[PDB]
Amino acid sequence: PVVVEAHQVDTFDVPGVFYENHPHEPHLSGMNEYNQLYQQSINDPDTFWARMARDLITFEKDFDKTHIGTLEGGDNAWFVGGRLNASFNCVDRHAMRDPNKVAIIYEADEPGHGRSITYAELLKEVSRLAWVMKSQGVRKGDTVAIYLPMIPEAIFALLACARIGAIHSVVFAGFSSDSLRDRTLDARSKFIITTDEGKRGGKVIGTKKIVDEALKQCPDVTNCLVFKRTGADVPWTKGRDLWWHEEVDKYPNYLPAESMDSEDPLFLLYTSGSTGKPKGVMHTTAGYLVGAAATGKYVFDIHPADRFFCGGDVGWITGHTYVVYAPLLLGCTTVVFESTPAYPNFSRYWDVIEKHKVTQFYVAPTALRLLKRAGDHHINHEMKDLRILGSVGEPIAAEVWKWYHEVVGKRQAHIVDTYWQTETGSHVITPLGGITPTKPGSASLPFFGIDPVILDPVTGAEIPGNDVEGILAFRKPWPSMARTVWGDHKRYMDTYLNVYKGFYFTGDGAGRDHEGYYWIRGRVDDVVNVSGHRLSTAEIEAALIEHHCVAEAAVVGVPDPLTGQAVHAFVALKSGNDNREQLQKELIMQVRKSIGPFAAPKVVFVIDIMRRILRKIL
Amino acid sequence: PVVVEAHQVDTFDVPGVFYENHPHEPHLSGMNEYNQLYQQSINDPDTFWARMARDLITFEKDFDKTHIGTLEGGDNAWFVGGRLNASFNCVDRHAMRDPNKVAIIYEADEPGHGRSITYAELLKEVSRLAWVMKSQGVRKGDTVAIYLPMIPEAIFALLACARIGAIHSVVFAGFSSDSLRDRTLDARSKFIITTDEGKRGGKVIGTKKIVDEALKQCPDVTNCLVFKRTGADVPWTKGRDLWWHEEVDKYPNYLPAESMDSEDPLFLLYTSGSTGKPKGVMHTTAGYLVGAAATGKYVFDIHPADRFFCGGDVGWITGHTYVVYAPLLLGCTTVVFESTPAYPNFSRYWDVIEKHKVTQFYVAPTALRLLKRAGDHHINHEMKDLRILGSVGEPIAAEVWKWYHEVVGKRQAHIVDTYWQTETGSHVITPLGGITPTKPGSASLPFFGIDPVILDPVTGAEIPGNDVEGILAFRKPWPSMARTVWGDHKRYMDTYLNVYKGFYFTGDGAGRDHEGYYWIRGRVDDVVNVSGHRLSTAEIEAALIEHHCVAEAAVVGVPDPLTGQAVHAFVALKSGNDNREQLQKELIMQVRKSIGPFAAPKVVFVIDIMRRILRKIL
Amino acid sequence: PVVVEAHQVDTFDVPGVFYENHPHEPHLSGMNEYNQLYQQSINDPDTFWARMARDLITFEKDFDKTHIGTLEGGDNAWFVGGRLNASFNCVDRHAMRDPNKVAIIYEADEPGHGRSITYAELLKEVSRLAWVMKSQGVRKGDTVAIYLPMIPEAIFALLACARIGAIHSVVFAGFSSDSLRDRTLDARSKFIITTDEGKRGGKVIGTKKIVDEALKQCPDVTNCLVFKRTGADVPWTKGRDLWWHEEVDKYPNYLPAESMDSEDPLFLLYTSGSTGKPKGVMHTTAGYLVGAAATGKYVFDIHPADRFFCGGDVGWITGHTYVVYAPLLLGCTTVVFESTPAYPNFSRYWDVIEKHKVTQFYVAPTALRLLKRAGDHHINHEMKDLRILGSVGEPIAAEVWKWYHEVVGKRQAHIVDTYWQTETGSHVITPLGGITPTKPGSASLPFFGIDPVILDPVTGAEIPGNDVEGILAFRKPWPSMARTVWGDHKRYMDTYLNVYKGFYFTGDGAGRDHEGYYWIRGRVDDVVNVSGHRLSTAEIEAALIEHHCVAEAAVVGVPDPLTGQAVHAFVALKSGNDNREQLQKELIMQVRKSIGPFAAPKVVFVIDIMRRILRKIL
Ligand SMILES: CCOP(=O)(O)OC[C@H]1O[C@@H](n2cnc3c(N)ncnc32)[C@H](O)[C@@H]1O
Ligand SMILES: CCOP(=O)(O)OC[C@H]1O[C@@H](n2cnc3c(N)ncnc32)[C@H](O)[C@@H]1O
Ligand SMILES: CCOP(=O)(O)OC[C@H]1O[C@@H](n2cnc3c(N)ncnc32)[C@H](O)[C@@H]1O
C-alpha cells in the first residue's frame, strides 16, 4: 500500500457504553448524517454555513451573504454585512439565560485553591476590565498585549478586549523578554496586561521583571496592568503600572458590548513559520467563532451541561479556541488549569478530572508519553463522566493511542485525534466525537466545509482517489481560516496561497488510505514540534548566530521518543575557543534569551546548507 | 399610632373640577388601574417595563431583555441590546411630526424679554452646537462641563452633548470656582460651556470670571464656549475661548444623532453625600429616559399640548429630569425660567403661569414658605389651565399644603408631593396626578416598579405590614436608578447597596401608616437640605477647617421655619484671636470660596464629635 | 416672443433607430410616464423619493422619513434615520452578485496601455487602500486631500475614503501649489494622496513637486501617499511620504465598510463663487447617491451592461457624479480616460468609444467646438452601441448640436443637454435619454423633484406661465442638494438661500418658452466659464493684485467662439514701468502661480468698478 501506516489498520467503532451512559441526545444520528451534511457543506457552502452560523451565533445584525472571495484572491470574507460581538456570544447571552451557571472552573497550581466562576460573575469581570482599558484610552481596533499564565483573569482579558473591539495579542507566558518585545512591537500595542508573578508546578515565574525588560524597548506602551497573583515585591513604574484589583474596583460591573463587523479583527497570534521572524496570524470575528462553536459542538460533542477541560496554554491556538472560545460560545463550563500534569504528582490531570466531573479532556501526545513513562499506578480515578478524549499537535502513536484508550479512558471514551493549525482557526481533519469510527494514528475524515486534496510535491498536481500520498492542501476556503499575517498580507499570500494556486497549503504531508482516511505525515518545511510547541529551525539558528563566537548555525529536526521531534543544533565557531565546555552554557543561554527556556537546545555541537544530511546522520 | 404624623389625617380626593376642566382623556381610569399596573410592575417587571419602554421611547434597535443584574450585584442593566439617542427622543421625533410646535418657553430675568422656541428651531440649535463640539474634538464618551444659568441655551447644551454621545456634567451656576474646578477635574472634561455673565433677579453673576479662575487648575480643558448673555466686557483667553454665536454660525443646522447603547452614560451630576467630596452620580440612557417619560406621563399627567413649568435649576436633578428630559421626551412645552420668584415682585411665578397658560407647576416648599410669608395679596391670577401642583425636596407641611391647595390652586389643582433623589433618576414615591388620593405631608404611594420596604435601623430587618417606622429601602432595581459613582464604583456599592444587602438604601427614614401611605422622615445620615439645596455637613466642616485659625469644626442640622433645615457651624479656634467680630467675616467667606454663596453659614460660633448634642442644644 | 432663443425652434423626437437598436427595455414608457412621475415628485415628494431611494440604494438600516427641513431654514435632511455606505453601494453589492463584471475601463494616455478592472478587483483595491489610511490614523469624519489625474487609482481613492467614512476632498490635478494648499488647509486634511507625475496628452505633470511645495504650508499633513505612475525620480520626504504599491501590499484585500448616517458628509468639492476664495461645497451621503443613481438611470438610460464614458475630470463635479458615483452605483462599466481628445490625434475620443463599445458619452461643448474646428475627417468610426450623447457646462449652440447629432451620432443617438451645478449634486434640468423631445440650445424640462420658477431679478417676484424670462430658482429642496459650505454655513445661507427667501438661487438667468422648455442664459453673477472650468473674476483679480506693480485689477467675461467665454484682465499699474512687454510675462505667471495654468490670462491690458462697461467695450 502507498500509505504504509494504514496497512492492516482496522477502524474501531465508538464504544457502546458511550451511548448508554451519555447524559443527552447526540448531535448527529450517525455517519450517514455526517456524510449528508458534509456533502452539502462542500457542494453548497453558502446554504450550509448560513444555517450553521445562525444556529450557533447570535448576530446583532444578520449577515447578507455567507462568503465572498476566493483562495487565490486572498480576499475571503464570511458572513459579510453581519454585526456581532464575541464577548456577547461567550458571556452575555448565557448570563441572560442562566446567570448562576458555572462558566469557568479555575484549578490553581496548588490543589484545593481554585474557584468556580458563574456566567454572571464572568460578565462582571469582563465588563469592569473592559472599563479599565477604555478609561486608559484603549479603542476599537487597537491591539492589546497579554502576557498571562493559566488563570481565569486570562479569559477575562481576552474577552474584555473582544468586548471593546480591541485585538488581543496573547504571548505565551514562557516566552523571553526578547520574544515578548518582538510581538508587542510588531503589533504596535499600547497597553499590556500581565501578572506580578506566575506559579506553575510550584515554581515562580518572574513575569513582571520580564515585561519590565521588554517594555524598555516598547516605547508605545503607556500602561501595564498587573494582576496580583503572588503578592511578591516586584519593581514598579509609577505613571505606567496599574494594579488590576485597584483599577477594576473603580468601574461599573456592566459595560455595553461594542458592535463589531463580521470581518473586524478579533485577535493576533504570533506563530513561527518556515522562514523569518514569528508572524501575527490574524483571525476575524464571525467566521472564527462559527468554526470554534461548530467544532466544539460536532467534534467534541459539547452540550451546555458539559465540563470541558483542554490542557493547552492560552498562549497557543489550542488554548484560544478550546479553552476559551468554543466552550464559552456553547455555554458549557471550561476548566482553566494553572499547574502541570506532574505537580504535586503524576496523578494531577486525573485528580482534576475526577474532582470536577470533567466530560471531555483535550491534550497533546507529549504529555501522554510523559505520563505513560511515569507508570499506570498514577491513574486510579473513576472519572465516570469522561466520554471524549482529545489529542492534538502530532500523530498519536499506536502504543499511546492504546494506553489512552484503555488505561485512561477505560475503553469508555472516544479518542478524537484532531488535525489543525493556528492558521485554520479550528479542527479541519478529525473524527466527530461519538460518531466517526477511528484508526490509531489517523486523523480520519475532514470536518464540515474542509475539502482536502493530495498534491504531488513537485508538479503540484492533484492526485485523485484513495491510497495516495503527497502534500496536504484544501481546495476551498472555510469560515475560520486566518485572514492575513499582520502587517504583511504579501507574506500570507506567498506562504499559504501562492504555493499551489487555487489551494490552501498546509505545510504538511499526508496520505489518504484505501478507505479515504487521512494520515498526517508532518511538516515538509522547516517547522518542527518541540514538546508541544511550534518552532522554526531558522529561529533557533538566528539565536545561535547572535553569539559573537558563532559564524554558521544549523538546526535540524529528528524523531524523539518523548518530545516527538528532537531539534538539534550545530555550530561552526568563527575561529576557535579553548573553553568548549564553557561555550556550551553560553550558547544555551543565548537561545534562552532570544526565544525562551522551552526552546533551549538539548546540546550545541561545536564543529567546523544541506540540512537533510544532518537529520539523516542524527 | 407608630407613625404619629398620620394620626387623624384623612385622604383628600382629586377635586371634581379637575376632570370637568381637563382638556384631554386621563392616562389611567382610576386607582384600580394603578393597582393593577403596580402589581404587574412588581411581580413581572420584565413584561411591564418592556411595554412601558416601547410605549414611551423610540429605539433605533429594539432591546433584547428588559433587565439583568441584581441590587446586591451592583450590575443592573436595563433594556440591554437596545440602541437609541436621547436627543432624538427629546427633539427629532417631535420635529419630524410637528416642527412648529413650541418646545421651550424662555422666560427671561426681565418680564417681557423671553421667546418661544419650536421643536424645529430646537433641532437646529442642538445640531449646530453639537457641530461646534465635534469640530473642537469632542467625541462619544467624553464628558463636557456645563456652567450655565436658566436660559434655553442650557437645554441646547445638554441635548447637544446627548446628540454626540458626550456625557454632560452640569455644575449649578451658583457654585464657586473651587466647586466648579473640583467637578471639572473629577469628570476629566476637556470642553466647558458657560455664559459671559448671568442675570437672575436683576443681579449680575460673573460666570466667566469664575470659570477663568477654575480653569487655571483644569489644564485638560482646551476650549471654553461662551454664550453672550449680557454682552459685558469679560476677560478673554485667545486660543481657548470661543464665542457661541460665532461658532454655531459656521456649521449646518442638522447633524446626525450618534447611536448610543441603552447603557452608555448619559450624564454625571455631582452630588453631596454623607462623607467625602461630592460624587458624580452617573445615569445611563434608556432606563433614565424611560423613568423620566413614565413619571412625566403618569405622575404629572403630561399630554403633548401641555405647558409644563418646573421651578428648579438645571444644576440639580429636578431640573435635569423635569425641566429638560421628561417634558421634551413626551413632546410637550417646557418653561425655562431665568428669574427668581421675587423679581420684579412676589407675583412673578403667577405672572409667568398666567401669561403662558401653564398646566403643571413644580416647585420646592422653600419657595412656597417664602411666598406665603410675603402675603396672599401677591396672588391675583386666574391661571385657568393650572391643574397639577408639584412639590419636591422636603415634606410639604400642613399649613403650606393648605395654602398651596387653596390660595394657589383655587382648590382646582391636584397637589402631588413627589419623593425621590438624584440617585433614583425620577419620582419613586408620589401620588399620580388626577388619580391618587392624597394626605397633607405624605408622599402617598410607590411609583410603578418601586418596591419600598421599612427596615429596622440597627438590625436591618424588614418590618412588615402597616403602621411601621424605620429606614426606607427599595427591594428591587428600577430602570432609572443611578448606575455608578463616576470613577468610584466601590463607593457606589458601599453607599447604596452594601449597607443592607439585597436592598437599595435611600438614606431616609420613613413611616408607612395604617393605610399603607408613606411619610418621609428625612436623612438619617449627615446630609441636610438648606433652602432647596442638598449639602453635606462634612463639606462645610472641611471648608471651615480650610481657615488657618480653625482647628476643629462641627456643622449640624436643625429645623428652621423658612429654610426647612438650618445648618449651623461651631468652630474651635487653634489658639486665640482678639478679632472675633472680624474672624466671622473671614470664616463666612471661606465657605463662600469653597462651596458657594448659597452654602455660606448663618453664623460661625467661636468657642473651644457628638454632633447630636449640638443639634439638640440648638 | 420673450424668450427670443426659442423662436421657431421645433422639438426633435428621439430617433426611431434608438429604440430598434436598444439592447434592453427602456426605464420609462414615454413622456406620459415622466409627467406622471414628475407630478408625484412635486406634489408628494415624501412618497416619490422614498420609493426611488429604496429602488436604487441598499441601506444597512432603512430610513424613517424621506425629508425634514425647508429651503429657508437651510436645515434640509433626506432619508433621516437611514444608514448606508457609498462604497458598499458602488462596489460590494455588485461584487457580491457578479464579481467578474467589468467596473472600470482605464484608457491610458498612450493608446493600448489601459486595463479593465472587475468589481471584485475594485473591491480589493478600495479595501486595501482603505487599510492604508486606517493604519496611518485616518478616521471617520476626517477629510482626505486627493490630487490625482484620471487613472483608476483616483476611483480607488474616492471610494476608499467613502469606505471608512473619511470625507474625500478632490483637487483638480491642474491646480497650482497655492490652490492645492488653500483647499488642503481649509479642509484641515491630515492625509493626502497623489502621483509621482501625471501624463496627459504626452506631457509630464510634476504632481509630486507641486504637492511638496504646497505641503510646506500644510503642517497638519502627516502622510502623503504617492502612486508610482511614471517611475520618475521625485523628491522624497522620509517619515511622511509613502509608496502606494509598498503600503497596499501589507494589508488584506477586504475591509469592512463603515456604517454611515444618511447625512454624514461624503465629500467636499472646492468651487469658485461670485465672491471670496473658493468654497468647500459639502455633499452628504444618501441624498447625493440617490440623485446620482436616479439621474444615471433616468437621464442617461443606464442599464447594468452599459459602458459609460464621461469626459470630465474627477477634479470637478461632473467627474464626481458621472465618472464615479452614478455608473458604479448602477453597476455598469465606467471609462476612466487619462488623455486628451487631441492625443495622439483628434480621433482619440472616437478611437476609445469604438474600441470599448461605449454606449453613452458625456462631454462639454468646449471639446466639441475644438474637435469641430479640427474637421470631420477625424471621425470615421462605426460606434454601433453609442445611443446617448451628453452635453454639459454651457448651452450647446445650434451648429454644434447639429454637428454632434449628425456627424458624431449618425442621427442615431439622443442628445441630452444636462443643466446642473456642483451645488445641485446631479442633473436638475435635462431631457431624459430616449424619452424627452429636445430643442437645440435648450435643456428642456426639469428632472424629478426639481420645481423651477422664474423670478423677477430685482423684485424677486415669481413670474408665472410660459414665455417668461428672469432669474432661475427652485421652489423646493431635492435629495442631492449641497448641504453646506464647509466651515461657513452662513455663506451657504447668504449665497443660495437668503437671496430669494423660500427659493434656491442658482445664479443663472433663464427663459421658459411657449412650451414650458427652459433656456439657460448663464451666470448673472461674476462667475464665468473658461474652457470648461468654473472660475471667479474676483479670483483672477486677486491674483493680478498679488503682483507688486498692480494697484487696481479688473477681470470681465465676454463671449468667445471656442472657449465659450473669454475672461480678460485690465490692470492699472501703481506708478509706471518701462518694461511693459516684460511685465506681461510676469503678470501671466502670477495667475499661473495663484490659480493654475488653465486660468492664465489671454492678455493683461496695462492701462490706468463698472465692469459692465468693460464687457461691452470688448
Ligand atoms: C493545533 C496546533 O497548531 P500549531 O501549533 O499552529 O501547529 C499545527 C501543525 O502541527 C501539526 N499537527 C497538529 N495537529 C496534528 C495532528 N493531529 N496530527 C499530526 N500533526 C498535527 C501539523 O504539522 C500542523 O501543520
Ligand atoms: C429630588 C431632589 O433630590 P436630591 O437633591 O438628591 O435630594 C433627595 C433627598 O431630599 C429629600 N426629599 C426629596 N423629596 C422629598 C419629599 N417629597 N419629601 C421629603 N423629603 C424629600 C430626601 O431626604 C431625599 O433623600
Ligand atoms: C455641471 C458643472 O457645474 P459647475 O462647474 O458648478 O457649473 C455650473 C454652472 O455652469 C453652467 N451650466 C452647467 N450646465 C449648463 C447647461 N447645460 N447649459 C447652460 N449652462 C450650464 C451654469 O451657469 C451653472 O450655473
Domains within chain A, CATH numbers bracketed: 4-452 (3.40.50.12780)
Task: Give A105's strand partners.
Answer: A116, A335
CA distances C326 to B17, C293, C426, Å, are 65, 5, 9
Whether the Cβ atoms of residue C317 and residue C421 lie closer than 8 Å to each other: yes
Residues annotated within a binding site of B: 200, 313, 362, 531, 592
For B73, the closest chain A residue by CA position comes to A253
Residue among C444, C425, C417 at smallest CA distance from C322: C425
Residue among C557, C457, C440, C569 at smallest CA distance from C505: C457
Q: Do C123 and A264 touch (CB under 8 A)?
A: no
Whether the Cβ atoms of residue B127 and residue B249 lie closer than 8 Å to each other: no
Q: Which residues of B touch C76 (CB under 8 A)?
A: 254
Q: Is A76 on the interface with C (CB under 8 A)?
A: yes
Residue among A159, A138, A128, A125 at smallest CA distance from A223: A138
The protein residue whose alpha carbon is closest to atom 5 in ligand 2 is B534
DSSP conformation letters of C503-559: SEEEEEEEEE-TTS-EEEEEESSSEEEETTEEEEHHHHHHHHHTSTTEEEEEEEEEE
Residue C151, classified by CB atoms within 10 Å of its CB into exposed (0-12), middle (13-18) or buried (19+), is buried
The protein residue whose alpha carbon is closest to atom 10 in ligand 3 is C393
For the record, the C-alpha cell of B252 comes out as 449646518
- Tally Cβ neighbours within 10 Å of residue C111: 15
Residue among B324, B286, B298 at smallest CA distance from B447: B298
Whether the Cβ atoms of residue B517 and residue B469 lie closer than 8 Å to each other: no
Distance from CA of A393 to the nearest CA of C (A): 28
Breaks in chain C (C to N over 2.5 Å), named by the residue before each, are 608
Q: Do A263 and C255 touch (CB under 8 A)?
A: yes
For C84, the closest chain A residue by CA position comes to A81
> From start to end of C7-156, where are the E strands?
65-68, 77-80, 83-84, 102-107, 115-118, 143-147
Write out residues 37-66 of B within 8 Å (CB-CB) of C. 60
What does the H/E/C string look like for A123-144?
HHHHHHHHHHHHHCCCCCCCEE
- Ligand 1 pocket check: which of A281, A323, A420 to mutate, most ligand atoms within 8 Å of Cβ? A420
Residue among C248, C179, C167, C246 at smallest CA distance from C211: C179
Whether the Cβ atoms of residue B163 and residue B151 lie closer than 8 Å to each other: no
Task: Give B512's strand partners.
Answer: B468, B518
Position C153: which residue type? E
Distance from CA of A163 to the nearest CA of C (A): 18
Give the Cα separation of A59 and A81 in Å (integer): 10
Write out residues 191-250 of C within 8 Å (CB-CB) of A. 249-250
Breaks in chain A (C to N over 2.5 Å), named by the residue before each, are 608
Cα A272–chain centre separation: 13
Give the Cα separation of C229 and C198 in Å (integer): 7
Give the Cα separation of C433 and C18 in Å (integer): 10
Task: Give B548's strand partners.
Answer: none
Q: Do A75 and C250 touch (CB under 8 A)?
A: no
Q: Is B264 on the interface with A (CB under 8 A)?
A: yes
Task: Answer yes or no: is the C-beta of C318 below 6 A from any ligand 3 atom.
Answer: yes
Q: Which of B128, B133, B253, B259 to mutate to test the interface with C (most CBs of C within 10 A)?
A: B253
Which atom number of ligand 1 is nearest to the Cα of residue A534?
Answer: 5
Residue among C238, C209, C261, C358 at smallest CA distance from C63: C261
Distance from CA of C212 to the nearest CA of B (A): 27
Q: Which residue has the cell 435643456?
A: C443
Q: Which residue has the cell 481628445?
A: C341
Residue B455, classified by CB atoms within 10 Å of its CB into exposed (0-12), middle (13-18) or buried (19+), is buried
Residue among C498, C520, C503 at smallest CA distance from C511: C520
Residue among B144, B141, B217 at smallest CA distance from B176: B217
Task: Answer yes or no: is the C-beta of C172 below 6 A from any ligand 3 atom.
Answer: no
The protein residue whose alpha carbon is closest to atom 17 in ligand 2 is B419
For A79, the closest chain C residue by CA position comes to C256
Q: Is B128 on the interface with C (CB under 8 A)?
A: yes
Ligand 3 centroid from CA B196, angstroms: 47
Whether the Cβ atoms of residue A488 and residue A480 lie closer than 8 Å to each other: no
Residue among A8, A49, A257 at smallest CA distance from A134: A257
Q: Which residue has the cell 446626525?
A: B256
Q: Do B254 and C490 touch (CB under 8 A)?
A: no
Taking only Cα atoms into account, the Rg of chain C, rounded to an integer number of angstroms, comes to 23
Residue among B301, B348, B331 at smallest CA distance from B23: B301
Cα B18–chain centre separation: 27
For the record, the C-alpha cell of B404 comes out as 398651596
Q: Is A95 on the interface with B (CB under 8 A)?
A: yes
How many Å is the maximal CA-CA distance in chain B? 71
For chain A, the 3-state helix, strand and coil shares in percent, each to the nearest 5, are 35, 25, 40
Whether the Cβ atoms of residue A244 and residue A227 lie closer than 8 Å to each other: yes
- The torsion of the CA quartet B544, B548, B553, B558, rounded to 10 degrees, works out to -30
Give the Cα separation of A126 and A211 in Å (integer): 23
For the record, the C-alpha cell of B461 comes out as 430587618
Give the Cα separation of B478 and B420 in Å (integer): 13
At C200 the three-state DSSP class reads strand
CA distances B311 to A98, B196, B390, Å, are 46, 23, 10
Is residue A592 marked as binding? yes
Of B76, B261, B490, the CB nearest to A249: B490
Give the Cα separation of A337 and A344 in Å (integer): 13
* CA–CA–CA angle A153, A159, A161 (5° rounding): 105
Of B65, B141, B488, the CB nearest to A250: B488
Which ligand has an atom closest to residue C366 CA? 3
Taking only Cα atoms into account, the Rg of chain B, rounded to an integer number of angstroms, comes to 23
Q: Do A96 and B75 touch (CB under 8 A)?
A: no
Q: Do A251 and B65 touch (CB under 8 A)?
A: no
Pocket of ligand 2 (CB under 6 A): B 271, 316-318, 392-395, 417-422, 443, 506-508, 520, 522-523, 529, 534
Give the Cα separation of C180 and A150 in Å (integer): 56
For B258, the closest chain C residue by CA position comes to C261
The protein residue whose alpha carbon is closest to atom 4 in ligand 2 is B421
For the record, the C-alpha cell of B331 comes out as 413632546
CB-facing half-sphere around the CA of B189: CA atoms within 13 A: 32
Which residues, 6 or more positions from A614, have their beta carbon under 8 angstroms from its beta carbon?
A554, A556, A568, A570
Give the Cα separation of C416 and B104 in Å (integer): 51
Q: Do B65 and A250 touch (CB under 8 A)?
A: no
Ligand 2 centroid from CA B530, angstroms: 12
The protein residue whose alpha carbon is closest to atom 8 in ligand 2 is B421
Whether the Cβ atoms of residue B278 and residue B270 lie closer than 8 Å to each other: yes
Whether the Cβ atoms of residue C15 and residue C386 lie closer than 8 Å to each other: no
Strands C102-107 and C333-337: parallel
- Backbone φ and ψ of B386, nearest 5°: -75, 105
Ligand 1 centroid from CA A525, angstroms: 13
Residues annotated within a binding site of C: 200, 313, 362, 531, 592
Residue among A327, A345, B467 at smallest CA distance from A336: A327
For the record, the C-alpha cell of C392 comes out as 454639459
